[PDB]
Amino acid sequence: GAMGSMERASLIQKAKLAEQAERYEDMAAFMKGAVEKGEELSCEERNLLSVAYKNVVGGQRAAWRVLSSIEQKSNEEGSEEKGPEVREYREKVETELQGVCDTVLGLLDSHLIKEAGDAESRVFYLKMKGDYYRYLAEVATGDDKKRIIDSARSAYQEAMDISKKEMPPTNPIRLGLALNFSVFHYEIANSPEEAISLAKTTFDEAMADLHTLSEDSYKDSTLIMQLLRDNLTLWT
Template structure:
């Protein structure tokens, strides 16, 4: 199939909620185009990857919540085994996504926006692994996520407008990583505060589309910061 046909079939798979197929249709596109994907194609890739792992992430959180209920303690062994199976599935999918981006995209990225976008993506999928990983796997994944997020942040702050949705989304996700994975509320707040302050300073200079995209991420930053600062004060 041609690249155009692969992209079309990926959209068909999206409408059919067949996200593994969607990823498989996009793999040849990634190999062919590398980092030269259009903004729409990058977004399509994000949808494919995120939906591929979202079901597993939700399932893991659900089982973890059930495990906390003492009523079901007698089923602890079976629940742990089932959760472990789903975790392995999540790790395989995330590892596949990270390897694909590293091999076929990041090394070929020629502009800073693409580099920041895909490095952020590596950080995100390392974060998804770190949500439930343990021991050596957790330690390595934390390091990999920090490296990817930090490199993406350096590029974004150097080259992208403070209201750029990639730069703002990166700051949002990096702050969530510090809060949820590193359990560093102070660092999460620092990152969120800086991104929010920088964006608000430039908001009046944005065109309508940038303003609209920025607003939704700004609201998420505000919500997170409100919760995190309350928690920090209570400690």
């Protein structure tokens, strides 16, 4: 595409610059270009890809929620009619969000997942697949909502199966996957008990493995464990 003429290494360098400048749309465009070179991504490069799109879609999600709340209030009793503009603008933001999700899912399907054979890379990408279907599910209201939800569930479940077989219970990717799949259960699948059980079991199994870790690995694992605890506190 537009980045076809730029060297892979230059795209990665500029993605790092864009991150420092908080230019996340640029960062995402650079990393899309890097993926489209066709080579596998290193750990650091996978992280850059995820950070860029997380920030872009995160801003879209926040805006969508603001607009959805205004729209909901406009449809209450006693609310004065203000015309189609709120719905139109919410739809505009929604369409842009769906476009970003489709772009990410397209990169994963063409061809990051199929060339990812190591457990750490495959789990990382399948977690992303689950996350971006989850974001599609957050805004879905039509006849494909069930299929969108099932796509998220399926991706998360494959990731979980691999992580449990191939990674230690303190591995940060495994922990972050479990954190997010637990949120999927609570917020998307209407399964709060499953969400709570998963967060608790994940936390406890990680706790029991901390003794094996260096100071630095301990810091990383305990940070994510605290996020599991925070959600458990919110939910109980």
